[PDB]
Amino acid sequence: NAVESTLRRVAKDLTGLRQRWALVGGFAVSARSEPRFTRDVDIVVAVANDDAAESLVRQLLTQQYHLLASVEQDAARRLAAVRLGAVVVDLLFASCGIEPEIAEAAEEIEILPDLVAPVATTAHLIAMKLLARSDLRALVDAASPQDIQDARKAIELITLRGFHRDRDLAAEWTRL
């Protein structure tokens, strides 16, 4: 209940600030395949640089959220994600490296009554789950062949940009 309310507000809010965002969590997956909800809202946001990110989060913290975590990294984009409180919202700026592909690529879908929201493509969802690690099994069982192709591409572009941790993701999959 808190979860749908949280999702509604942040969507209101992100749209409000004309951001390029995309659901990549429980609702997203549920939309692209079968019911796999969580008590977390996972969203990607395409933003220019760390200033953009910082600024966005400041603007959101004037609203009715609190900052529960900054996730940082040694690379050119310091600020990978943040986690906010209202139920928790993870915002991903540069966790996977294809945030802006994902957000261009998302499609608007009506998730709840009179809530349309952009939703990561199945292929992207597959990419991201692999990287985080039956959320995945679901997405794959559900995925069309072209879906699988796009996923491989998405995998590749993550690896190129070198957010692949140090993992052969291509590999990790054929296994699973």
Author numbering: 2 to 87, 95 to 141, 151 to 193
From the paper:
The Mycobacterium tuberculosis NTase toxin family, MenT, modifies tRNAs to block translation. MenT toxin activity can be stringently regulated by diverse MenA antitoxins. MenT and AbiEii toxins share four highly conserved NTase motifs scattered throughout their structures, proposed to facilitate co-ordination of metals (motifs I and II), base stacking, and transfer of nucleotides to tRNA isoacceptors (motif III), and to contribute to catalysis (motif IV).
The MenT1-p structure shows clear density for a phosphothreonine (TPO) at position T39. Alignment of each structure via C-alpha atoms only returned an RMSD of 0.410 Å (160 atoms), indicating a near identical topology of core domains and folds. Structural alignments also revealed that residues R37 and F38 are both ejected from the toxin active site following phosphorylation. However, phosphorylation greatly reduces the net positive charge within the MenT1 active site. Accordingly, when MenT1 and MenT1-p were incubated with E. coli tRNAs from the cell-free PURExpress translation system, we found that MenT1-p was unable to inhibit GFP protein synthesis. When compared against the calculated Rst of this model, the observed Rst of the unknown species almost perfectly matches that of the hypothetical heterodimer, returning an observed/calculated Rst ratio of 0.97.
